[PDB]
Structure 1
């Protein structure tokens, strides 16, 4: 089972932070991280990565943990993929 790992927009989470996230938990470089960041900001969400079930859960929960400790509302989610 492949799972989309999606990052969902909110008016409050700083852009730097989303970049932080993208570099820390997906190993994207600064350049790509900004693409996706703008994507979350303007399109309202962006598929960060596609992973297998177990790995995807670990990510979601990780991203959510990190966000809550840095006191931001960023919601990161799962939902199949199919593809």
Structure 2
């Protein structure tokens, strides 16, 4: 089993922060990060990758922790692929 890791839309997290997260935690360049951000905003969410269970778990925890440390509500989730 592999797991999707997803970012979900919200009304407060700034664009530049979503881009930052996509680069830091998912290794996307600016253009692709920005595309994924567009999907977050207009599809309501974007799948950012597929990973092993333990890697997905760790990524979800770390992205959410990073977001809250900067007082943003950005929500990262996992689900079975």
What TM-score comes out, normalization by structure 2 length?
Answer: 0.97
In structure 1, what is the equivalent of residue 46 of structure 2?
46
Show structure 1 runs of 4+ deviating over 3 A: none
Runs of 5+ in structure 1 lacking a partner?
Answer: none
Report Cα offsets for 1:32-75 as digits up to 9, x if no partner.
Answer: 00000010011100000110100000100000000000100001
- Match of 2:73, SS state, is coil
Distance (Å, rounded) in 2 between the aligned partners of 1:79 and 1:49: 11
Distance (Å, rounded) in 1 between the aligned partners of 2:65 and 2:11: 19
1:59 maps onto 2:59 in alignment: yes
- Match of 1:77, SS state, is strand
Runs of 5+ in structure 2 lacking a partner?
Answer: none
What TM-score comes out, normalization by structure 1 length?
Answer: 0.95
Aligned residue pairs: how many? 81
- Match of 2:13, SS state, is coil
Distance (Å, rounded) in 2 between the aligned partners of 1:37 and 1:62: 19
